Structures are given as C-alpha cells and as structure tokens.
C-alpha cells in the first residue's frame, strides 16, 4: 500500500510523514510531495529510520511522480484564496494520476476545501463520494484529551464522537455518547466551548508564530492508519470524518463512518443526541451550508 | 519521571517532543524550553494528544522552570546540525549555548541525566563535563553524547544491503559522532557477513550519512526527523532504565576509563543512576582495529578543544 502526502514539507506534513514512516505496516510505500525544494531531503532524512516503509520525496510544480500508484492521498498543502487554489490544483493532479485513491483533506477550512475537491473530481468524471474525506480527527483526539483529564480516565481509552463540521460552532462533540461518564450542563457547555475554540488556544500560545502542527499530524496519522487498515481488509474500523452523505443535514457532514476496502462502507447513524446537542446541531446547519457553497462557487 | 527538552522549538526538538509525548510511560512529565517565543504553544499543541504525559513549554533566556525537578535533560539547542566548516563553524556558534544551558542544569537539576544532542557532540560533551565539574556536581554516569543517529542509520543500511527486516538489525557503533570518529562494528552484527568492499563502503556512508540529507534537502536543511527519532530511542531507553528495567543497553558517548580517549562511545548498560556498567567493545576486525587507532588523536583534539573553552 502506498500513501502520498501533499504538502509534506510543512509543519503538519513533516510531523505526519514522521509518524507514517514509523507506524505504517511493513511493506508500505510513502511518497512526499511539496513545492518546497527541501522535500526530497525530508524523505531522505526519514529514510534513515530503520522501519520497513520505503519513502521518496518530490518537489517542483508537478506532483505526478508522487501520486503514481497511490492508494491514499493526504493533502496538508498551502499556508483562503491561495489555499483554495492550491487544493484545486492538487486534486486535479490526483484525478489525472490516482483517480481511485482515497483522498483525505487536511488543508483548512475543511468545510470548504472538501467541497472544492468534490467539484474538481466531478468535473473530471472520477468522483467517488466514498473516497473523499475531510480529516476532522483533531477535534476527536482533542475531545478525548479534555474529557479524560476532567473525569480522571486513561486518555488513550476515551473516545468522544464528534460530528458536523471542522470549524467553530460546526464542531459538535457528542459528550452524551461517551460510555461510563456523565457531565453537568456546566461541563457540557464548557467542553463544547473549548473543543470549538481549541484551535485558537494553540494560536495564542505560539506567540503569533503558527497554528497546530504536531497534534494535527498525530490526528492525520490516526486517520491515515485507520484508513490503511480498512483498505487492507481489517473489519470494524470506524472514524468520524467529514464526507458527502445522504444530505439529511448538509451535502457534506461529518459522522461516524465504517471504513472498508473501498473507502466508506457505511455512514453510521449519529445515534440519539442530548437536547443541547441538537440545539447546537440545527443551530449551525446553514453556517455549514454556507461553507459548502463557498467551495462550489470557487471552482466555477 | 520528568524529561526536559532544551531547544524544543527547533526541528529536532519538535520531532523529539512529539515522539516523547506519545511513547513516554504513563504518568511521565515533559517540559519544553527554547528561547523562541513559540515554545509554550509547542507544548499546548502537543498537549491536545490523548496520552498520559503532561507537557508545558517555556521561553525566555531562563530555562529554570522547565528544568525544575527534571530527571532527564535532552539538549538539542542552538544549531545542533549539520556540516558547516570542517565542524568548527558549529563549535563557535554552539559552545557558548551548551555552556549556558549545562550551567543552568547544574544549579537546578544537577542530579538529572544529561543527553547532549547539540553538535559537535565529540566536543560539546567535554564542554558539559567541565562545566558540571566547576559547579561541583559532575557525575560521569549521567552525561551522555547522543550518537543513536549513527546506530539507526547503520541498522537501515545494513538491513538494506543484506536483505533483512530493518527493525531486526542492531549494529554497535563506537568512537565518536563525526567523520572518521564514527566506527560501526559491522563484524558484530549477528548472523550476517560483509566483504572488505562492503565494510569500507558501508563505513564510508555511515561516516558521511549527514551529507545524504544535506544535498537532498537542496543544501538548505539537516537531518531533523531521523535525529528526533534517534534521540527519542535514546531517551526512552534511558527512562526505562531509570524506572528499574534491567538489560537496557545503548551505545552512547560518555567519559570512560580512557583506554582510547577520555570520552568514547561504546555499549552502555543503563541503570537507575545512569550508566550502570561500561561494556567492552568486543573483538574487533583488522579493519575496525585500523579505524579505531587512526581516529583517536582527532577525537582527543575534539575533547581538548572543549576543555580549553571553559577555563
Ligand atoms: Ag481507497
Ligand atoms: Ag539520571
Ligand atoms: Ag549497543
């Protein structure tokens, strides 16, 4: 299995590529692409790590040699209209070289960039709405972290389902669906506030010198490794991700997803919410509906 | 168990802190320091990862709060890599930085184990040792030069040449951490054999493996992610030994019995107070014998250069 990382020279890409090189199953392939000329040396750097994952790096404007034979393409490129244009460019190169690969969108805003990728794939005739994901894992592992410390549990065993979007009030952690724990509304309100503002938390703490990179690479790695496991035949792999579903909420919506050999195999029900969980649900569906149309207007 | 990472805002430091945050034992402590103002957010970034490892980051020129109660100090500050000058551009840049931080270590966490990542390691460890002595707290069993990058590189290249699984190959590397001071004991890799051509070519590559990365990074970057991995392996092995695990062996640059030089890399049995026992380098090939004696007085000039700087 071959994984391509677009934008691998950035903070997120290098962290993601380091975890993939050390955690992808033996025999896997890892290709790194980024416009930055340093990218072929990022792969040589990683290639000195003694794991059974071959890795090669590519630079320049053409991403084709890195996408040839790619089964999964993770895109953390860019640094709104410059990032939207870069997303559109790279999805074009993917549709030309690896049209049936699974595509995980990391470049933000996810709510809008996934819509851009969808329209680019449709205009190419190679669109599979089961193979395009918006990577929202960071909200989940953030929720897991915050919940575990408040309630004194093992952080690695907490799993909070997060649904909706990847921006602000569109991020909805389903804290009522976490087993063995209850929360006061004072805790439901505060946790939902921090999870939807945790991105700002790292922005302020970095002295205006960057966004979340290492935790995002960790979250992107979790999603990529789950995807590879399910693509390789493992059963019962479920991750919450931002996909094009039934339209019951928006054209693009993040919910728990059963992953399979062809990307998504079942978009799981969101369960049954608390009262506040559907107040925050319906109370943002146009804020998510507007983010999607912004992505479809950009292409045409 | 509290681990302090000095220089945590750099490429090596950020990759190191990322691996430590996920692989350190549950209940461990991680403190990040770097003069760069981004360092507190580097820890807040890592703090959002659901592992039982608490983390906080500090900036300014005072590393005291990060070193407070530290059991291990990993220093990858300054310009910890890579090929500049013959190696003396880095010395003049990093010598004062290593001296500053090791000084702060000796007056806040003098009992902590110290791992020096900042290069030139052959010389920066001598700076650290002498600085700890004049502070009156020098423990020869608690000061290491991190040479693990040479080992995992040799594991990679040997597993590649001999068609073996990369995680199953372990190559002992002795001597120093630069050029001809890097001696991989290919004659001790269990279950494989090499030719003279392979020994000389593999050694040559391992001794200059940093140039593979520099010229590939378009001349504008060093080995950062592989170094963070190598430093993580060394730190995790040290922490395991510090928590009571027995049989933890890692090759690293320490002050030994001076059979070859005052400081020398060799297999080290690690214990609850740092170095438990300095193991013998075993029987050497004729090639490894020639390589050893042919590199000692340049290793000694490396050590002498660092001693002169502190007095
Ligand atoms: Ag796929
Ligand atoms: Ag110690
Ligand atoms: Ag060893």
């Amino acid at each position: 299995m071959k994984v391509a990382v677009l934008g691998a020279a950035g903070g997120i890409g290098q962290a993601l590529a380091l975890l993939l090189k050390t955690q992808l199953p033996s025999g896997s392939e890892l290709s790194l692409y980024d416009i930055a000329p340093v990218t072929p040396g990022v792969a040589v750097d990683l290639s000195h790590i003694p794991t059974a994952v071959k890795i090669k790096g590519f630079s320049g404007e053409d991403a084709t040699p890195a996408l040839e034979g790619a089964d999964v393409v993770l895109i953390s490129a860019g640094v709104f209209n410059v990032n939207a244009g870069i997303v559109k460019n790279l999805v074009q190169q993917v549709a030309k070289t690896c049209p049936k690969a699974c595509i995980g969108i990391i470049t933000n805003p996810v709510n809008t960039t996934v819509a851009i990728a969808a329209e680019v794939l449709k205009k190419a005739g190679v669109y599979d709405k089961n193979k395009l994901f918006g990577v929202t894992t960071l909200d989940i592992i953030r929720s897991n972290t915050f919940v575990a410390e408040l309630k004194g549990k093992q952080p690695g065993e907490v799993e909070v389902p997060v649904i909706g979007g990847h921006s602000g009030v569109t991020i909805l952690p389903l804290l009522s669906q976490v087993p063995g724990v209850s929360f006061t509304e004072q805790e439901v309100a505060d946790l939902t506030k921090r999870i939807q503002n945790a991105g700002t938390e790292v922005v302020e703490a970095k002295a205006g010198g960057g966004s979340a990179t290492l935790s995002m690479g960790q979250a992107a790695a979790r999603f990529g490794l789950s995807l590879v496991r399910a693509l390789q035949g493992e059963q019962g792999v479920v991750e919450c991700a931002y996909v094009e579903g039934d339209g019951q909420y928006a054209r693009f919506f993040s919910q728990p997803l059963l992953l399979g050999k062809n990307g998504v195999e079942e978009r799981k029900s969101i369960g049954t919410l608390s009262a506040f969980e559907q107040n925050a649900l319906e109370g943002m569906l146009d804020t998510l509906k507007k983010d999607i149309a912004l992505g479809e207007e950009f292409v045409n």
Side-chain angles (χ1 to χ4, degrees), chain A residues 168 171-173 175 187-197 280:
Chain A
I171 307 168
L172 183 51
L175 306 146
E187 287 153 357
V188 173
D190 291 28
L191 276 154
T192 307
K193 183 203 212 123
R194 183 173 184 192
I195 294 159
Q196 298 173 331
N197 276 89

Side-chain angles (χ1 to χ4, degrees), chain A residues 123-137:
Chain A
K123 292 220 144 290
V126 289
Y127 182 50
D128 192 325
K129 42 201 102 204
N130 289 323
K131 298 191 169 186
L132 176 72
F133 309 77
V135 186
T136 65
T137 312

Side-chain angles (χ1 to χ4, degrees), chain A residues 138-215:
Chain A
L138 185 49
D139 293 332
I140 290 117
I141 72 166
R142 275 168 176 168
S143 320
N144 301 340
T145 295
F146 307 148
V147 162
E149 333 308 330
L150 167 53
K151 303 279 138 223
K153 298 313 177 193
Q154 293 186 9
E157 308 298 323
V158 178
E159 278 301 321
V160 184
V162 190
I163 59 137
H166 198 43
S167 192
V169 315
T170 73
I171 307 168
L172 183 51
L174 269 41
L175 306 146
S176 72
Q177 299 192 356
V178 186
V181 54
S182 49
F183 309 84
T184 82
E185 328 104 326
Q186 193 73 23
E187 287 153 357
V188 173
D190 291 28
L191 276 154
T192 307
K193 183 203 212 123
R194 183 173 184 192
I195 294 159
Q196 298 173 331
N197 276 89
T200 310
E201 206 178 312
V202 177
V203 168
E204 325 204 280
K206 276 191 174 185
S211 196
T213 60
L214 301 166
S215 60

Side-chain angles (χ1 to χ4, degrees), chain A residues 27 75 82 97 119 143 147 159 165 187 211 224 237 251 256 258 295:
Chain A
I75 308 178
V82 174
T97 312
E119 283 301 328
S143 320
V147 162
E159 278 301 321
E187 287 153 357
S211 196
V237 182
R251 187 212 171 180
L258 183 63

Side-chain angles (χ1 to χ4, degrees), chain A residues 1 70-72 100-103 130-131 133 227 231 260-264:
Chain A
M1 191 134 290
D71 298 282
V72 177
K100 287 177 327 304
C102 299
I103 311 189
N130 289 323
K131 298 191 169 186
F133 309 77
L227 179 54
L231 282 190
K261 291 156 106 147
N262 319 282
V264 197

Side-chain angles (χ1 to χ4, degrees), chain A residues 273-275 277-295:
Chain A
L273 286 313
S274 153
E277 288 171 8
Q278 193 161 230
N279 184 237
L281 183 43
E282 269 130 36
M284 69 91 180
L285 255 76
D286 311 316
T287 320
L288 183 80
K289 193 241 93 163
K290 57 174 217 62
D291 283 320
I292 301 178
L294 171 58

